Design a protein around this ligand. Structure first.
Ligand SMILES: Nc1nc2cc(CCNC(=O)[C@@H]3CCN3C(=O)[C@H]3C[C@@H](c4ccccc4)CCN3)ccc2[nH]1
Length: 318
Protein backbone atom coordinates (compact mmCIF):
# COMPACT_ATOMS: atom_id res chain seq x y z
CA UNK A 1 0.00 0.00 0.00
CA UNK A 2 2.79 2.39 1.00
CA UNK A 3 5.47 0.45 -0.91
CA UNK A 4 9.11 -0.30 -0.08
CA UNK A 5 10.64 2.50 2.02
CA UNK A 6 13.38 4.75 0.73
CA UNK A 7 16.93 4.02 1.86
CA UNK A 8 18.53 6.40 4.36
CA UNK A 9 22.01 7.71 3.41
CA UNK A 10 24.50 6.65 6.09
CA UNK A 11 21.62 4.67 7.59
CA UNK A 12 19.21 1.93 6.64
CA UNK A 13 15.65 0.58 6.79
CA UNK A 14 14.33 -2.23 8.97
CA UNK A 15 10.79 -3.62 8.82
CA UNK A 16 9.22 -3.90 12.28
CA UNK A 17 5.76 -5.39 11.63
CA UNK A 18 7.21 -8.01 9.28
CA UNK A 19 9.58 -8.59 6.36
CA UNK A 20 7.96 -6.85 3.40
CA UNK A 21 4.70 -5.64 4.97
CA UNK A 22 3.94 -2.17 3.58
CA UNK A 23 0.18 -1.91 4.21
CA UNK A 24 -1.84 0.46 6.40
CA UNK A 25 -0.55 0.75 10.00
CA UNK A 26 2.59 -1.21 9.02
CA UNK A 27 5.61 -0.04 11.04
CA UNK A 28 9.19 0.44 9.85
CA UNK A 29 12.27 1.86 11.59
CA UNK A 30 15.16 4.02 10.40
CA UNK A 31 18.57 4.19 12.05
CA UNK A 32 22.06 5.62 11.52
CA UNK A 33 25.52 4.32 12.38
CA UNK A 34 25.13 5.90 15.80
CA UNK A 35 28.84 5.88 16.73
CA UNK A 36 29.92 8.39 14.06
CA UNK A 37 26.50 9.65 12.88
CA UNK A 38 23.42 11.02 14.66
CA UNK A 39 19.80 10.93 13.54
CA UNK A 40 18.07 14.29 13.10
CA UNK A 41 14.48 15.43 12.40
CA UNK A 42 12.64 12.59 14.18
CA UNK A 43 13.28 9.29 15.99
CA UNK A 44 13.02 7.16 12.82
CA UNK A 45 9.77 5.33 13.59
CA UNK A 46 7.47 5.58 10.55
CA UNK A 47 3.97 4.12 10.19
CA UNK A 48 2.19 3.78 6.85
CA UNK A 49 -0.74 6.21 6.91
CA UNK A 50 -4.05 6.31 5.05
CA UNK A 51 -2.52 8.90 2.71
CA UNK A 52 -0.52 6.00 1.22
CA UNK A 53 2.95 7.18 2.23
CA UNK A 54 5.20 6.57 5.22
CA UNK A 55 4.72 9.07 8.06
CA UNK A 56 6.74 9.66 11.22
CA UNK A 57 5.46 10.30 14.75
CA UNK A 58 5.48 14.06 13.95
CA UNK A 59 3.59 13.93 10.63
CA UNK A 60 6.63 14.23 8.35
CA UNK A 61 6.65 12.11 5.18
CA UNK A 62 10.28 12.83 4.20
CA UNK A 63 13.40 10.94 5.26
CA UNK A 64 15.25 11.73 8.48
CA UNK A 65 18.88 12.86 8.28
CA UNK A 66 22.02 11.02 9.44
CA UNK A 67 24.31 13.90 10.41
CA UNK A 68 28.03 13.16 10.94
CA UNK A 69 29.45 13.81 14.39
CA UNK A 70 31.80 16.81 14.28
CA UNK A 71 34.50 18.49 16.32
CA UNK A 72 36.15 15.39 17.80
CA UNK A 73 39.92 15.51 18.28
CA UNK A 74 42.68 13.40 19.80
CA UNK A 75 44.02 16.56 21.47
CA UNK A 76 40.92 16.77 23.69
CA UNK A 77 52.82 26.87 9.90
CA UNK A 78 55.57 28.90 11.57
CA UNK A 79 56.93 27.84 14.94
CA UNK A 80 54.68 24.82 15.39
CA UNK A 81 55.06 21.10 15.94
CA UNK A 82 53.87 17.89 14.36
CA UNK A 83 50.26 16.80 14.70
CA UNK A 84 49.50 13.22 15.72
CA UNK A 85 46.83 11.09 14.02
CA UNK A 86 43.34 12.31 14.86
CA UNK A 87 44.33 15.76 16.14
CA UNK A 88 42.75 17.36 13.05
CA UNK A 89 40.54 14.72 11.39
CA UNK A 90 38.82 17.50 9.40
CA UNK A 91 42.05 18.64 7.70
CA UNK A 92 41.86 18.44 3.90
CA UNK A 93 44.64 18.84 1.32
CA UNK A 94 43.63 20.56 -1.93
CA UNK A 95 45.89 20.18 -4.98
CA UNK A 96 45.34 22.20 -8.14
CA UNK A 97 47.14 25.41 -9.00
CA UNK A 98 49.22 25.23 -5.81
CA UNK A 99 49.14 23.49 -2.43
CA UNK A 100 46.25 24.64 -0.24
CA UNK A 101 43.97 23.28 2.48
CA UNK A 102 40.41 23.06 3.70
CA UNK A 103 38.21 21.58 6.40
CA UNK A 104 35.64 18.81 6.04
CA UNK A 105 32.03 19.78 6.78
CA UNK A 106 29.47 16.96 7.09
CA UNK A 107 30.73 14.10 4.85
CA UNK A 108 30.49 15.81 1.44
CA UNK A 109 31.56 19.48 1.82
CA UNK A 110 34.92 21.25 2.20
CA UNK A 111 35.32 24.78 3.56
CA UNK A 112 38.31 26.70 2.20
CA UNK A 113 39.46 30.15 1.08
CA UNK A 114 38.18 31.63 -2.17
CA UNK A 115 41.64 32.75 -3.31
CA UNK A 116 42.91 29.16 -3.06
CA UNK A 117 40.40 27.69 -5.55
CA UNK A 118 39.41 30.70 -7.67
CA UNK A 119 41.72 30.05 -10.62
CA UNK A 120 40.77 26.36 -10.88
CA UNK A 121 37.00 26.90 -10.57
CA UNK A 122 36.89 29.42 -13.42
CA UNK A 123 39.23 27.20 -15.45
CA UNK A 124 36.55 24.47 -15.07
CA UNK A 125 39.17 21.99 -13.79
CA UNK A 126 38.26 19.66 -10.94
CA UNK A 127 40.12 19.94 -7.64
CA UNK A 128 42.19 17.02 -6.32
CA UNK A 129 41.05 16.67 -2.69
CA UNK A 130 42.86 14.39 -0.24
CA UNK A 131 42.36 13.65 3.45
CA UNK A 132 42.90 11.03 6.12
CA UNK A 133 46.66 11.57 5.83
CA UNK A 134 49.27 13.45 7.85
CA UNK A 135 51.88 13.36 5.05
CA UNK A 136 51.31 15.86 2.24
CA UNK A 137 52.96 13.65 -0.40
CA UNK A 138 51.97 10.16 0.78
CA UNK A 139 50.42 7.74 -1.74
CA UNK A 140 47.96 6.47 0.93
CA UNK A 141 45.00 8.84 1.30
CA UNK A 142 41.24 9.06 0.92
CA UNK A 143 40.48 10.47 -2.53
CA UNK A 144 37.63 12.83 -3.38
CA UNK A 145 36.83 15.18 -6.25
CA UNK A 146 34.92 18.44 -6.51
CA UNK A 147 31.42 18.29 -7.98
CA UNK A 148 30.88 22.05 -7.62
CA UNK A 149 32.80 25.01 -6.21
CA UNK A 150 30.91 27.97 -4.71
CA UNK A 151 32.90 31.19 -4.29
CA UNK A 152 31.40 33.98 -2.20
CA UNK A 153 29.71 36.50 -4.46
CA UNK A 154 31.34 39.51 -2.77
CA UNK A 155 34.85 38.13 -3.28
CA UNK A 156 36.89 40.03 -5.88
CA UNK A 157 39.97 38.06 -6.91
CA UNK A 158 43.30 39.93 -7.04
CA UNK A 159 41.55 42.88 -5.33
CA UNK A 160 41.85 42.16 -1.62
CA UNK A 161 40.50 39.44 0.64
CA UNK A 162 37.12 40.58 1.95
CA UNK A 163 34.75 37.59 1.75
CA UNK A 164 37.67 35.19 1.17
CA UNK A 165 35.54 32.07 1.62
CA UNK A 166 34.40 29.20 -0.58
CA UNK A 167 32.60 25.86 -0.37
CA UNK A 168 33.39 22.71 -2.37
CA UNK A 169 30.74 20.03 -2.93
CA UNK A 170 32.36 16.60 -3.10
CA UNK A 171 31.08 14.18 -5.74
CA UNK A 172 31.08 11.38 -3.12
CA UNK A 173 30.38 11.03 0.58
CA UNK A 174 33.58 10.33 2.52
CA UNK A 175 33.53 7.67 5.23
CA UNK A 176 33.49 9.12 8.75
CA UNK A 177 35.67 7.47 11.40
CA UNK A 178 38.25 8.46 14.01
CA UNK A 179 40.63 9.27 11.14
CA UNK A 180 38.19 11.46 9.15
CA UNK A 181 35.63 13.67 10.95
CA UNK A 182 34.25 17.12 10.06
CA UNK A 183 34.72 20.30 12.07
CA UNK A 184 31.66 21.82 13.72
CA UNK A 185 30.28 25.11 12.52
CA UNK A 186 30.17 27.77 15.27
CA UNK A 187 26.96 28.29 17.17
CA UNK A 188 25.59 31.82 17.54
CA UNK A 189 27.16 32.19 21.00
CA UNK A 190 30.54 30.88 19.79
CA UNK A 191 31.95 34.44 19.84
CA UNK A 192 32.14 34.00 23.63
CA UNK A 193 35.07 31.63 22.91
CA UNK A 194 36.62 33.96 20.28
CA UNK A 195 37.28 37.09 22.34
CA UNK A 196 40.56 39.00 22.29
CA UNK A 197 43.38 36.79 23.69
CA UNK A 198 41.29 33.61 23.32
CA UNK A 199 43.38 30.80 21.83
CA UNK A 200 42.72 29.14 18.49
CA UNK A 201 44.67 26.55 16.51
CA UNK A 202 45.86 26.77 12.91
CA UNK A 203 47.06 23.62 11.15
CA UNK A 204 48.54 23.02 7.72
CA UNK A 205 51.45 21.97 5.54
CA UNK A 206 52.50 25.53 4.68
CA UNK A 207 55.89 27.16 5.02
CA UNK A 208 57.69 26.71 8.33
CA UNK A 209 60.54 28.75 9.80
CA UNK A 210 62.85 26.78 7.48
CA UNK A 211 61.19 28.44 4.48
CA UNK A 212 59.96 25.19 2.89
CA UNK A 213 56.63 23.40 2.85
CA UNK A 214 56.24 20.87 5.65
CA UNK A 215 56.21 17.17 4.81
CA UNK A 216 53.96 16.42 7.82
CA UNK A 217 50.94 18.29 9.15
CA UNK A 218 51.91 21.00 11.66
CA UNK A 219 49.95 23.20 14.06
CA UNK A 220 50.26 26.20 16.39
CA UNK A 221 48.14 27.62 19.19
CA UNK A 222 47.84 31.41 18.81
CA UNK A 223 45.67 34.09 20.43
CA UNK A 224 43.11 36.41 18.89
CA UNK A 225 44.50 39.91 18.35
CA UNK A 226 42.68 43.11 19.26
CA UNK A 227 41.02 44.37 16.10
CA UNK A 228 42.58 47.83 16.42
CA UNK A 229 46.03 46.23 16.43
CA UNK A 230 44.94 44.10 13.46
CA UNK A 231 43.86 47.13 11.42
CA UNK A 232 46.93 49.12 12.44
CA UNK A 233 49.41 46.35 11.58
CA UNK A 234 48.43 46.43 7.88
CA UNK A 235 47.42 50.09 7.39
CA UNK A 236 50.65 51.03 5.63
CA UNK A 237 52.36 50.44 2.27
CA UNK A 238 52.31 48.31 0.15
CA UNK A 239 48.84 47.30 1.38
CA UNK A 240 45.66 48.94 0.05
CA UNK A 241 43.78 51.06 2.55
CA UNK A 242 41.04 49.08 4.25
CA UNK A 243 42.77 45.74 3.72
CA UNK A 244 41.45 44.60 7.13
CA UNK A 245 37.63 44.59 7.27
CA UNK A 246 35.05 43.55 9.85
CA UNK A 247 34.85 40.13 8.13
CA UNK A 248 38.37 39.31 9.38
CA UNK A 249 40.22 38.47 12.58
CA UNK A 250 43.94 38.59 13.33
CA UNK A 251 45.85 35.97 15.29
CA UNK A 252 49.47 35.83 16.37
CA UNK A 253 52.03 37.28 18.74
CA UNK A 254 53.21 40.86 19.12
CA UNK A 255 56.66 39.32 19.70
CA UNK A 256 56.37 36.92 16.74
CA UNK A 257 57.30 33.27 16.45
CA UNK A 258 53.90 31.61 15.85
CA UNK A 259 51.89 32.07 12.66
CA UNK A 260 50.26 30.66 9.59
CA UNK A 261 52.02 31.16 6.27
CA UNK A 262 51.88 30.45 2.55
CA UNK A 263 50.65 26.95 1.79
CA UNK A 264 48.23 27.03 4.73
CA UNK A 265 45.56 28.83 2.65
CA UNK A 266 42.05 27.58 3.38
CA UNK A 267 42.90 25.81 6.62
CA UNK A 268 40.55 26.17 9.57
CA UNK A 269 41.50 28.22 12.62
CA UNK A 270 39.67 26.15 15.23
CA UNK A 271 38.51 26.84 18.78
CA UNK A 272 37.25 24.59 21.59
CA UNK A 273 33.68 25.03 22.77
CA UNK A 274 34.60 24.09 26.34
CA UNK A 275 30.96 23.40 27.31
CA UNK A 276 30.09 21.02 24.45
CA UNK A 277 33.73 19.77 24.43
CA UNK A 278 33.74 20.11 20.64
CA UNK A 279 36.07 21.94 18.26
CA UNK A 280 34.57 24.41 15.79
CA UNK A 281 35.94 26.54 12.95
CA UNK A 282 36.32 30.22 13.82
CA UNK A 283 38.66 31.29 11.04
CA UNK A 284 39.94 30.41 7.57
CA UNK A 285 43.59 31.03 6.67
CA UNK A 286 43.41 33.98 4.27
CA UNK A 287 46.40 36.34 4.10
CA UNK A 288 49.10 38.29 5.89
CA UNK A 289 52.51 39.82 5.39
CA UNK A 290 55.28 38.20 3.37
CA UNK A 291 57.40 37.64 6.50
CA UNK A 292 55.44 34.98 8.36
CA UNK A 293 56.23 34.69 12.05
CA UNK A 294 57.58 38.24 12.22
CA UNK A 295 56.70 40.31 15.27
CA UNK A 296 53.37 42.12 14.95
CA UNK A 297 52.81 40.88 11.37
CA UNK A 298 49.75 38.87 12.29
CA UNK A 299 48.01 36.26 10.20
CA UNK A 300 44.67 37.43 8.84
CA UNK A 301 41.72 35.02 8.78
CA UNK A 302 38.21 35.14 7.34
CA UNK A 303 35.66 35.44 10.17
CA UNK A 304 33.47 32.37 9.72
CA UNK A 305 30.69 33.31 12.16
CA UNK A 306 29.87 36.21 9.84
CA UNK A 307 29.18 33.69 7.03
CA UNK A 308 26.86 31.14 8.70
CA UNK A 309 23.82 32.36 6.68
CA UNK A 310 25.80 32.08 3.44
CA UNK A 311 27.15 28.61 4.27
CA UNK A 312 23.76 27.25 5.34
CA UNK A 313 22.09 28.69 2.23
CA UNK A 314 24.51 26.89 -0.09
CA UNK A 315 24.67 23.58 1.78
CA UNK A 316 20.88 23.43 2.17
CA UNK A 317 20.03 24.42 -1.43
CA UNK A 318 22.56 22.11 -3.16
N1 LIG B 1 51.84 36.95 9.07
C1 LIG B 1 51.26 36.11 8.03
N2 LIG B 1 51.50 36.21 6.62
C2 LIG B 1 50.72 35.18 5.93
C3 LIG B 1 50.60 34.86 4.55
C4 LIG B 1 49.76 33.78 4.11
C5 LIG B 1 49.70 33.48 2.58
C6 LIG B 1 48.33 32.97 1.92
N3 LIG B 1 47.61 34.05 1.20
C7 LIG B 1 48.16 34.52 -0.03
O1 LIG B 1 49.15 34.09 -0.51
C8 LIG B 1 47.41 35.68 -0.74
C9 LIG B 1 47.27 35.61 -2.27
C10 LIG B 1 48.22 36.84 -2.40
N4 LIG B 1 48.31 36.90 -0.90
C11 LIG B 1 48.94 37.66 0.13
O2 LIG B 1 48.78 37.37 1.29
C12 LIG B 1 49.87 38.92 -0.18
C13 LIG B 1 49.17 39.99 -1.09
C14 LIG B 1 49.27 41.55 -0.82
C15 LIG B 1 47.91 42.14 -0.24
C16 LIG B 1 47.03 42.82 -1.11
C17 LIG B 1 45.81 43.37 -0.70
C18 LIG B 1 45.39 43.26 0.63
C19 LIG B 1 46.23 42.58 1.52
C20 LIG B 1 47.46 42.03 1.08
C21 LIG B 1 50.51 41.91 0.03
C22 LIG B 1 51.18 40.82 0.87
N5 LIG B 1 50.24 39.63 1.16
C23 LIG B 1 49.09 33.09 5.11
C24 LIG B 1 49.18 33.39 6.50
C25 LIG B 1 50.02 34.46 6.90
N6 LIG B 1 50.32 35.00 8.20
Amino acid sequence: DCGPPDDLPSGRVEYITGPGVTTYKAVIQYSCEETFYTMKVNDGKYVCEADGFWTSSKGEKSLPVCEPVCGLSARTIYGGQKAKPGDFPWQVLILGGTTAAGALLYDNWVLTAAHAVYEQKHDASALDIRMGTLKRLSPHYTQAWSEAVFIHEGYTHDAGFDNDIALIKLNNKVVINSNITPICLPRKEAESFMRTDDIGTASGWGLTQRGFLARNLMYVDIPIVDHQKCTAAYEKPPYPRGSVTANMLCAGLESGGKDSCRGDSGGALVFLDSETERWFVGGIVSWGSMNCGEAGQYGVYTKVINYIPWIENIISDF
